[PDB]
Structures are given as C-alpha cells and as structure tokens.
Amino acid sequence: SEQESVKEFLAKAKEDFLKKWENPAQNTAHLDQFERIKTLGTGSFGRVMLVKHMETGNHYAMKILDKQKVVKLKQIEHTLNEKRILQAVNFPFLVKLEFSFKDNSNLYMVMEYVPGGEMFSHLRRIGRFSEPHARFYAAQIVLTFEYLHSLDLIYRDLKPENLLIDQQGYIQVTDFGFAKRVKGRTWTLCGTPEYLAPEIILSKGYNKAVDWWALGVLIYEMAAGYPPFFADQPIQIYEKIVSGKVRFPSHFSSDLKDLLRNLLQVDLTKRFGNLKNGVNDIKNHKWFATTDWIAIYQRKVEAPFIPKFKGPGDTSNFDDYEEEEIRVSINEKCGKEFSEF
C-alpha cells in the first residue's frame, strides 16, 4: 500500500508539471527591481549572485547568463531546457524558481537563496561524512530522481558542487543546465568527468540509468572523501570508468559495498534503478533499512548537520569571488535564438 500511495502522488505531480511545461511563465520581473550584493559562484556562461528584491526586502540568488557566451558554446537548447524545466517542477529538494526575464545582453533566473552553502565546501573541509550522514543525503537524491524520472526528465549533472544545504540541513538540487525531457535515448556528451557513466563516454546512446550511476559516485565520494575514479587528466579518468574496476576503502560497511557494486555496474541490464523493480531495488536495499522514506520527504528527520546562519543576507558559508560589473548593451543580442525564454 506504500507503493500505491507513491504512485498516486506522482500521478498528480505529473498533471501539475504538464500544465506548466506546456504554458511556461515568461518575463515576470526586471533587473532594476533588484539590488546586487555579492557573487556566490561562477560557471562558463556567467555567475550566480545574492540579490535583494527592493519591493519586498526578500533576498534571492540570481543566475546571470551572457547570451553571446551561450551561443558561442552551443548551449542554446540546453539553456532553453533549463528554464522551461525549472519553472514547471515542484519538489521539496529542488530549488524554487521565482522570476525569470531577459534584456539586451543577458538571461536571468531568480531562485530562492539557499544560505547553508554547497555540500562540496563542507565535504572538502570535514574530509568525509559518516555512513549515516551520507545516507541522509543519498535518500533525498533517491526521492528526487524518482520524481524527476517519472516526468521523463534526466538530470545529468549530479555532484557535491550542485547540492546546496538549507537552513534545516536538507539538500536543494540546483543547476538544471543539462536537464532534458526525453522519452527514448539521448546522445549528448555532457556532465562532469568524475561522474560520467561508461555509456556516455562510449557514445552508445543513453537514458535515465546515467543518473543512477552518478548517485553511486556521489555516495562513494561522500563516504570516502574522494571519488572512485580520479586522475589529473580527464582522459585518464575515462580509462578508469570504462575498465570496470572499483576499489573500496576498508572502512566501508559490507552493505554499502553491496549497494555500490550494483549502482556502479558497467552493464546497463544489471544496474540498480534500471531493472524491473525500478527505484524499488534501491529503496529496499539493506543499506537503507533504517530510512523512513516518508519522514525524509516530509522533512521530519533531524539533520545530522545544520549550517551556522547569522541572519538574512549572510554569505559566510560561501567562498569569495572577484566581482565583475553587469554590462547591458544598447543593442539587442541574439533576439531570435532566445525568443521563447
């Protein structure tokens, strides 16, 4: 009866998604409504900044993409995908998109500000998380992928850099730049090298099973403190991924090793998440025996770690970046390419 309830919830969440998917919100704010405070992180197309909404006094995180840079890198369709998907989804562990708009130079997406910082920062500083701490995070991602995959979405860029910790110590998944809604197979070589499934590297055509492989890598990295395949050059990492060879640190519990062998399965027809029981093979695994899936979803479990928060607008959980001016050209750049944004 637990399985049937999940199934009904997902049926309704699909209907809500589809109405927004088919009729996307557009142009819901303007730049001059926001005071820009500080840069929170960077990427190849622009940056994410802490901003304050002047009419309400609320703080947000604003993602800014340079249209000319997106075109140069051939990321037009990926950028249109990102916004279209993010405006339509609704889940406790996904960052909420509040406004989007564009001007002559840039695209803008304004999301809830998540003050606890990136999982990456905390993981590097502590070294590694204990198995129960790792388990708490992993559960949230399992439920998030169950939601996403039921909507025909593939996420494709799971890693600690993309996972933000909120005030309550729960995860928010951000950065939907490679997410795609797709019923069959897809072929784009994208993602982060340490996290890529072998079928992506081998140019085979691939599906949602790549997210389950990436979850294997994440769980290993959280519990070990380093990823299962690392080297100084990406080409060297690819060699290791396809080889089929994983070593586990001696402190891994036998249950965790077992989970991991089934997620890091080079053979698609043997990989947990891609068998007939689907996500249930993962949720029913021994390693997750103590996880109350409903309590996690409702956010009722006490988090193992809560970040220090010193009031609204505090950025102490984030690194410092050099600040750059936002230049807005007097001529419209790339109008046709981004007309649907």
Partner: peptide
C-alpha cells in the same frame, strides 16, 4: 594512502562540466 594521493592531485577543487 589513496586519500593522500587524492589531496595532492589536480582535481580537489570545484569541477567544471564538459559541453563538447
């Protein structure tokens, strides 16, 4: 140790996505 090998490696910082 593997941990020491990792910490001395070129990839302990934030990792960029690939597009190409």
């Amino acid at each position: 140790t593997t941990y020491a090998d990792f910490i001395a490696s070129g990839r302990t910082g934030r990792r960029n996505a690939i597009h190409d």
